[PDB]
């Protein structure tokens, strides 16, 4: 089997991407944030505290003929941005882009944090990291990809995120029309439950490439690119007037600037992030200070190749017995 779904930016900045997901019978279509940095499929639901729902589409298990309470199971997750959610669990039929999994754990939110409520465009998350991070207790549950894997033509999914445009998530096949050149594969560590890999270095603009190992995760659920402070300082030193603002919470730059590109290494290959991808716009409406898309990871404990980096590539998440990542230009 295969599946193919279009993913759409939620706003003009590509702050996140939503992908329609069919849950239950008859289908209830919710727009989920596919997140390769977490492992829970959770949704706004008929169980969500009413004051915490503001415009999201909700899953109502009682209207699904295939929904079953997973008795005793609860979940609770906290993300890197400080957001959180929790609730109970149903199993149901879940389809993405024509690929169907029966018996998928659908984690129904009873509580969501303010950042979820305030984002009307995101009806929940669909985690695509390794199932070892799934938070369901007392019986850990599998991701949609882990449940689909054995049925897929190839045990892979691909992320092809757009810059200010829709893109695609494919399951079970590699669309050889979606990228240029060849795909460079690189090793993955699953020890922290992430798609964790080691970049071979970086360049700023037309500058020379610096060979240096940068361990980090491929995380579609993170907007920005978070790298070590040395790398980030080297990048923003090339932008006149850029500075790290403790008041704003990262590097800002004059909105009049033209940003340089940033290149990262994948083995001997190179992925170029155009400068425009690094512009996240005014820090507040009407400001002439703009927020940067490359930020320090120093306060995180891990480097994160988020959407700023991934949208510059065609990315293969290879879930073979020994997982690997692949990157191609596009």
UniProtKB/Swiss-Prot annotation:
GO terms for biological process: proteolysis. Its EC number is 3.4.23.22. The keyword Metal-binding does not apply. It catalyses: Hydrolysis of proteins with specificity similar to that of pepsin A, prefers hydrophobic residues at P1 and P1', but does not cleave 14-Ala-|-Leu-15 in the B chain of insulin or Z-Glu-Tyr. Clots milk. The active site is at 35, 199. It is an enzyme of class 3 (hydrolase). Keywords: Aspartyl protease, Disulfide bond, Hydrolase, Protease, Signal, Zymogen. This is Endothiapepsin. The chain holds residues 90 to 419 of 419 of the full protein.
